[PDB]
Scaffold this active site. Sequence first.
Site, PDB file in Angstrom:
ATOM      1  N   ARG A   1       0.778  -1.211   0.000  1.00 14.62           N
ATOM      2  CA  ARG A   1       0.000   0.000   0.000  1.00 14.62           C
ATOM      3  C   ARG A   1       0.804   1.251   0.000  1.00 14.62           C
ATOM      4  O   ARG A   1       1.994   1.247   0.288  1.00 14.62           O
ATOM      5  CB  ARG A   1      -0.932   0.028   1.185  1.00 14.62           C
ATOM      6  N   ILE A   2       0.104   2.318  -0.342  1.00 11.11           N
ATOM      7  CA  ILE A   2       0.670   3.639  -0.289  1.00 11.11           C
ATOM      8  C   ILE A   2       0.123   4.351   0.935  1.00 11.11           C
ATOM      9  O   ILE A   2      -1.100   4.512   1.104  1.00 11.11           O
ATOM     10  CB  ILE A   2       0.333   4.443  -1.561  1.00 11.11           C
TER      11      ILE A   2
ATOM     12  N   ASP B   1      12.260   3.436   1.964  1.00  9.21           N
ATOM     13  CA  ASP B   1      11.399   3.351   3.140  1.00  9.21           C
ATOM     14  C   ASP B   1      12.183   3.035   4.430  1.00  9.21           C
ATOM     15  O   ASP B   1      11.976   3.682   5.475  1.00  9.21           O
ATOM     16  CB  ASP B   1      10.268   2.334   2.938  1.00  9.21           C
TER      17      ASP B   1
HETATM   18  C1  LIG Z   1      12.641  -4.613   1.618  1.00  9.95           C
HETATM   19  C2  LIG Z   1      11.592  -3.682   1.035  1.00  9.95           C
HETATM   20  C3  LIG Z   1      10.843  -4.404  -0.076  1.00  9.95           C
HETATM   21  C4  LIG Z   1      10.623  -3.285   2.164  1.00  9.95           C
HETATM   22  O1  LIG Z   1       9.591  -2.408   1.684  1.00  9.95           O
HETATM   23  C5  LIG Z   1      12.203  -2.371   0.497  1.00  9.95           C
HETATM   24  O2  LIG Z   1      12.888  -1.682   1.570  1.00  9.95           O
HETATM   25  C6  LIG Z   1      13.197  -2.580  -0.628  1.00  9.95           C
HETATM   26  O3  LIG Z   1      12.820  -2.772  -1.787  1.00  9.95           O
HETATM   27  N1  LIG Z   1      14.497  -2.523  -0.293  1.00  9.95           N
HETATM   28  C7  LIG Z   1      15.613  -2.555  -1.234  1.00  9.95           C
HETATM   29  C8  LIG Z   1      16.727  -3.516  -0.782  1.00  9.95           C
HETATM   30  C9  LIG Z   1      17.351  -3.255   0.562  1.00  9.95           C
HETATM   31  O4  LIG Z   1      16.845  -2.435   1.359  1.00  9.95           O
HETATM   32  O5  LIG Z   1      18.412  -3.890   0.786  1.00  9.95           O
END
Ligand SMILES: CC(C)(CO)[C@@H](O)C(=O)NCCC(=O)O
Lengths: 258, 248
Positions: B11-12, B99
């Site tokens: 979700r957003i 995020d």
């Molecule tokens: C792990 C998720 C999917 C959680 O929303 C996101 O933070 C994301 O795509 N992270 C990129 C890879 C990382 O944080 O190592």
Amino acid sequence: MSGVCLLIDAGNSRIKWALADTGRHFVTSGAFEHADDTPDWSTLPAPRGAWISNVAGDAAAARIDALIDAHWPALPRTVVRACAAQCGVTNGYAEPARLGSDRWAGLIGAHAAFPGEHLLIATFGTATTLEALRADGRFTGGLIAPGWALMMRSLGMHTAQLPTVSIDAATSLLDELAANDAHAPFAIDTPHALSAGCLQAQAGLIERAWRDLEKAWKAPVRLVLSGGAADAIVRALTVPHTRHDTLVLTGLALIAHS
Amino acid sequence: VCLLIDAGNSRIKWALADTGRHFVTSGAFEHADDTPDWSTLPAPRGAWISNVAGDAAAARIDALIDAHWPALPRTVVRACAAQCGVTNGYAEPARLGSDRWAGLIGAHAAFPGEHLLIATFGTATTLEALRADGRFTGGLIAPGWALMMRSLGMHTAQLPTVSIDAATSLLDEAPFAIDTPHALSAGCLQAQAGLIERAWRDLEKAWKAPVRLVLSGGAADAIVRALTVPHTRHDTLVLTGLALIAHS
Ligand SMILES: CC(C)(CO)[C@@H](O)C(=O)NCCC(=O)O
Ligand SMILES: CC(C)(CO)[C@@H](O)C(=O)NCCC(=O)O
Ligand SMILES: [Cl-]
Ligand SMILES: [Cl-]
Ligand SMILES: [K+]
Ligand SMILES: [K+]
């Protein structure tokens, strides 16, 4: 007369087999894939029958039959299923027949392998499964979670940014985990964040379940581990454990020779 | 006021912030075919967007912003080496999810002077270790509860597919299960709880110090109820980090 039984353990990821002359001993054994692959059985001594555990569906069942018939026409065979009670084990599932046949055979193998002991059996395959088995043979219940590789794939397939690591790259990451020291720290790169996160989820499940079981039963419980991911999981575990990688085939041997 | 967008895979989430620290209002919606009610909102000065859900979501978000405030200034937020008192320990800082980064920034501000373990229960379950000095030292990513259960139904021949709502009712319904749906509900839940508990204990051991376990964003009641370790809920960490970035 033939003294050997052919045993087949067909799971969702692969098919394992053994030729057993007793309830505990194998003359030979191996494994193959579901597609474009066939085991070397033309050198095997003819078995008196086949005992087949299959949790991989009807296609796999038909394929296994085709292989058995292509070597020993009209060989007697038994499709192994969980039932109320067998080989010293009693099935505590609400509906005994709904328990996976692989799990049933593993319970029977473990009961024989570790007499007089309470056990928690952890088997690492497509799924990670746990079964609680009392010393008196009562299978009291269990748990099911995705296995390490399935966890890894789920993350790539259901997020935009996480990679879906290939079969080979996943095997490489698992092998890296199996080279880790105890108390590995967190990761600083995405592929290792996935590999370690999924591994810690496996270790966390097993340890939490084991401690819960000892506390519930008020007795020592032998944690028995099986499967490819065990090498990596053992590096992360701090609790005592035993490795037994032939519980299911042993259980099939015990059923066949009963 | 600043419009803050936290687009995840499921979700957003959004908020309207008048400072780095205060929300006028907030909410959440699903990618399709839903939409936020922004009709009664005061016009924002700009938007700050974290988006880990891909280029498509980025287009839906833009269209949404443009439909209310045409050509509104906006900034796509990405992880970087250092921002808002947090330093990024990733080998390649920009590869950290935006995020997770915003959440780190929010956590550093919300719990000053403390070592933290941030656990975020979304599509994926993530963990980040954050020192009191702002150093993000590393983290872990595992599938979330729903993803774990769905993976079993979709990638085995015999297992059913069980939702969070369904599993929650089954688990509300010695120490393990005697039927398949309860076995997978419980197995997946205990993997979630075990992961968090083990990571927290190991981090306190490694740092020889107390660590506050912060449960970020929503988290299924069943997960929170299962934990045997102390925890603090902060449901707006990512949005509060975006508010800090916007006012920096
Ligand atoms: C792990 C998720 C999917 C959680 O929303 C996101 O933070 C994301 O795509 N992270 C990129 C890879 C990382 O944080 O190592
Ligand atoms: C859990 C698996 C997939 C493990 O191979 C298999 O044992 C199975 O399909 N079991 C049926 C469901 C149950 O055992 O509750
Ligand atoms: Cl007993
Ligand atoms: Cl999946
Ligand atoms: K992906
Ligand atoms: K299925």
